[PDB]
Amino acid sequence: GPLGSMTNINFSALLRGERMCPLTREIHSQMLIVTKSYSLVETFRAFPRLPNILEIGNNIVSDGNLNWGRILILLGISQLYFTKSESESERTQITEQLERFFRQDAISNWIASNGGWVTCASLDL
């Protein structure tokens, strides 16, 4: 049979911020730029203690639009939750919640029709 699905971005490597392939490393850099530029640390305090990244991602497309900045905001929020986590169970759930968001057909199709993650990595922020 054909090759089964594989992740485009390694979200576990992204959020652990250690070993990363070049594309994931550049997305990480972009995520931190957006985190600082949009003061995400400050707004993050108003989010719930218990992460629900799928809900947050679906909130950010509630108006029916998507763009790479919104994706980087979602990642940056996910990173703040991941950093604040105190168990491997929570960290795994955050990563699984992220993967579930990006595997939704509309999100996946948007990424593929808007230049892929390489185009995200290449934005001049």
XYZ file of C-alpha atoms in Angstrom:
125
model
C 0.000 0.000 0.000
C 0.889 3.695 -0.066
C 2.830 5.420 2.688
C 0.802 6.280 5.769
C 0.516 9.753 7.214
C 3.578 11.333 8.815
C 3.896 14.684 10.561
C 5.107 17.686 8.610
C 6.272 19.413 11.788
C 7.608 17.474 14.749
C 5.557 19.280 17.404
C 7.169 17.409 20.291
C 10.621 18.528 19.128
C 9.292 22.035 18.543
C 7.946 22.447 22.053
C 10.950 20.824 23.730
C 13.221 23.253 21.881
C 16.232 20.965 21.886
C 17.076 18.758 18.905
C 15.085 20.002 15.886
C 15.392 19.667 12.106
C 16.094 22.889 10.219
C 12.470 23.550 9.326
C 11.222 22.956 12.852
C 14.048 25.124 14.231
C 13.084 28.015 11.953
C 9.411 27.695 12.883
C 10.531 27.802 16.526
C 12.403 31.038 15.866
C 9.341 32.557 14.150
C 7.146 31.431 17.061
C 9.351 33.256 19.551
C 9.332 36.437 17.422
C 5.519 36.387 17.350
C 5.355 35.575 21.058
C 7.345 38.705 21.846
C 5.779 40.955 19.190
C 2.243 40.229 20.334
C 3.036 40.195 24.067
C 1.689 36.692 24.345
C 3.103 36.158 27.822
C 0.755 38.876 29.069
C -2.410 37.655 27.366
C -1.590 34.035 28.243
C -2.289 34.753 31.913
C -5.972 35.117 31.033
C -6.193 31.587 29.533
C -7.398 28.597 31.582
C -4.981 26.595 33.663
C -5.992 23.378 31.902
C -4.837 23.375 28.248
C -7.231 22.693 25.381
C -5.154 23.445 22.312
C -7.716 22.042 19.879
C -10.321 24.448 21.249
C -7.879 27.367 21.092
C -6.941 26.587 17.489
C -10.558 26.289 16.460
C -11.277 29.574 18.239
C -8.582 31.362 16.246
C -10.283 30.396 12.937
C -13.796 31.169 14.201
C -14.154 34.058 11.755
C -13.437 31.657 8.902
C -9.984 33.050 8.107
C -6.498 31.728 8.722
C -3.016 33.125 8.220
C 0.485 32.233 9.300
C 0.513 34.797 12.098
C -2.507 33.148 13.693
C -0.779 29.774 13.382
C 2.318 31.152 15.103
C 0.148 32.623 17.888
C -1.390 29.176 18.419
C 2.041 27.589 18.574
C 3.308 30.249 20.968
C 0.364 29.677 23.308
C 0.959 25.941 23.110
C 4.628 26.522 24.002
C 3.705 28.560 27.075
C 1.407 25.764 28.255
C 4.086 23.155 27.524
C 6.787 25.063 29.399
C 4.484 25.474 32.393
C 3.566 21.755 32.438
C 4.692 19.632 35.367
C 3.993 16.098 34.082
C 4.787 14.096 30.980
C 1.086 13.279 30.700
C 0.220 16.952 30.259
C 3.037 17.564 27.756
C 1.956 14.595 25.660
C -1.656 15.755 25.649
C -0.606 19.253 24.535
C 1.335 17.801 21.609
C -1.517 15.444 20.715
C -3.996 18.328 20.922
C -1.795 20.318 18.514
C -1.489 17.434 16.076
C -5.264 16.940 16.142
C -5.817 20.593 15.238
C -3.466 20.526 12.258
C -4.838 17.224 10.938
C -8.303 18.719 10.467
C -9.043 18.766 6.754
C -9.612 22.521 6.479
C -6.410 23.387 8.366
C -4.301 20.857 6.466
C -5.719 22.056 3.135
C -5.038 25.685 4.073
C -1.397 24.966 4.900
C -0.929 23.112 1.617
C -2.558 25.888 -0.419
C -0.657 28.700 1.340
C 2.863 27.511 0.582
C 3.449 24.933 3.308
C 5.485 25.338 6.460
C 8.510 26.240 4.318
C 6.653 29.383 3.308
C 5.876 30.084 6.970
C 9.546 29.618 7.790
C 10.446 32.047 5.025
C 8.248 34.991 6.061
C 10.205 38.132 6.876
C 8.846 39.015 10.311
